[PDB]
A paper describes a structure:
GluA3, a subtype strongly associated with disease, functions as both a fast-transmitting Ca2+-permeable AMPAR at sensory synapses, and as a Ca2+-impermeable receptor at cortical synapses. Here we present cryo-electron microscopy structures of the Ca2+-permeable GluA3 homomer, which substantially diverges from other AMPARs. The GluA3 extracellular domain tiers (N-terminal domain (NTD) and ligand-binding domain (LBD)) are closely coupled throughout gating states, creating interfaces that impact signalling and contain human disease-associated mutations. Central to this architecture is a stacking interaction between two arginine residues (Arg163) in the NTD dimer interface, trapping a unique NTD dimer conformation that enables close contacts with the LBD.
GluA3-G–TARP-γ2 determined in the apo state diverges from existing AMPAR structures in its sequence-diverse NTD tier. Similar to GluA1 receptors, GluA3 lacks the interface between the inner B and D subunit NTDs that is typically observed in GluA2; as a result, the two GluA3 NTD dimers are separated. Furthermore, the GluA3 NTDs stack onto the LBDs—a close apposition of NTD and LBD is apparent throughout 3D classes, where we observe receptors with two upright NTD dimers, both interfacing with the LBD, or those with one upright dimer and a second one bending towards the LBD. GluA3 with two ‘double upright’ NTD dimers accumulated in the centre of the conformational landscape, while receptors with bent NTDs localized to the periphery. Overall, receptors with two upright NTD dimers appear to be a prevalent GluA3 conformation. We constructed a double-upright GluA3-G–TARP-γ2 receptor to a resolution of 2.5–3 Å. Moreover, the NTD closely apposed the LBD, giving rise to a previously unseen NTD–LBD interface. Interface contacts are established exclusively with the LBDs of the A/C subunits (but not with the gating-dominant B/D LBDs), resulting in an outward translation of the NTD dimers that underlies the expanded appearance of the receptor. We measured a >20 Å translation of the inner NTDs towards an A/C LBD, when comparing GluA3 with either a GluA2 homomer or a GluA2/3 heteromer, using the GluA3 marker residues Arg183 (NTD) and Tyr471 (LBD) and the corresponding markers in GluA2.
Numbering used by the authors:
A (entry chain D): 789 to 828
B (entry chain Z): 6 to 39, 56 to 70, 73 to 83, 93 to 161, 174 to 210
C (entry chain C): 539 to 554, 570 to 635
D (entry chain B): 587 to 634
Write the structure that this text describes.
């Protein structure tokens, strides 16, 4: 009766996907600003 | 700075070795199966009390996708690869003292390796759905050490850019 | 906590006095207050930090509701038994 | 914290953040237990 990890696995997948998305967004902004500062 | 680099290198080597040992060994789960008490890893199941000869785990649309991901063990292997890449970045940054983006790359690799470890753990437990052996906890400790080393590498990156600011 | 600290503090262009309050220790506090839904000190302001915060908020909401619902199920079922 | 309402000020030191955080865990396991037991009492009238 104790609900298992399979009952809430999808929310874990969503959480890790959101973490990866935030990392990607931050890194893309950093690369864009690096290129802009190289130009300027 | 040198002490931080030493901690980062030792932790990077420790997490990588722990994850490699966990992936290689077969003490992931103590359960009962072919009808004997056995211990299984990611690839082989062998009996405790034949005492030792192993079977390849019979790993076989959402259920099919989960079984394929579990069978390939893509996420623990990817964690091993990312830890290796982080170590390579640490070594290259030791070679190239002026390129600070290598430290950042190493930190990103370590954090990503930890995240891949989390995904692999969740996939393994769901596919299993007993007791957990020392390979499971080796992988968990590898995750913890990888996240600590990633935090420390990000700290080194921040400190170096702060030093350039002044 | 680690990803929140990373996306909040790594970029030197955000620093140009820290750009925000989300160090690793503060990231560990924001994240715990959120899980307990009893937290109100500082809130992430950047896009990626808000992504981390919102996804962690959704995780917390689902997990806490599941805990309460399963505890209610246990208690109701043990009242049912005879 | 117990009433699940507000902060005004938050602890900043390690020990305060340890005291605050174990109070937050108690406040969440006690208030979930209260709600779950009230639901159990209302659903099933185990009746003497």
């Amino acid at each position: 009766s104790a609900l298992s990890l399979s009952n809430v696995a999808g929310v874990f997948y969503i959480l890790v996907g959101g973490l990866g998305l935030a990392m990607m967004v931050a890194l893309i902004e950093f690369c864009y600003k690096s290129r802009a500062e190289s130009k300027r | 700075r040198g002490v931080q680099m030493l901690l980062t290198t030792v932790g990077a080597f420790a997490a990588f070795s722990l994850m490699t040992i966990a992936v290689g060994t077969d003490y992931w789960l103590y359960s009962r199966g072919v009808e004997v008490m056995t211990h299984s890893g990611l690839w082989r199941t062998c009996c405790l009390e034949f005492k030792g000869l192993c079977k390849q785990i019979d790993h076989f649309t959402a259920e099919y996708f989960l079984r394929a991901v579990r069978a390939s063990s893509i996420f623990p292997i990817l964690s091993v690869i990312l830890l290796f890449m982080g170590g390579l970045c640490i070594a290259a940054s030791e070679f190239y003292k002026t390129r600070h983006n290598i430290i950042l790359s190493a930190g990103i690799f370590f954090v990503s390796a930890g995240l891949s470890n989390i995904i692999g753990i969740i996939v393994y437990i769901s596919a299993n759905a007993y007791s957990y052996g020392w390979s499971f906890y080796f992988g968990a400790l590898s995750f913890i050490i990888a996240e600590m080393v990633g935090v420390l590498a990000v700290h080194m990156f921040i400190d170096r850019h702060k030093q350039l600011r002044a | 906590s680690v990803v929140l600290f990373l996306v909040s503090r790594f970029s030197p262009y955000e620093w140009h006095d820290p750009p925000n309050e989300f160090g690793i220790f503060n990231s560990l506090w924001f994240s715990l207050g959120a899980f307990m839904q009893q937290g109100c000190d500082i809130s992430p302001r950047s896009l990626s930090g808000r992504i981390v915060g919102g996804v962690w908020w959704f995780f917390t909401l689902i997990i806490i509701s599941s805990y309460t619902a399963n505890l209610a199920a246990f208690l109701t079922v043990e009242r049912m038994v005879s």
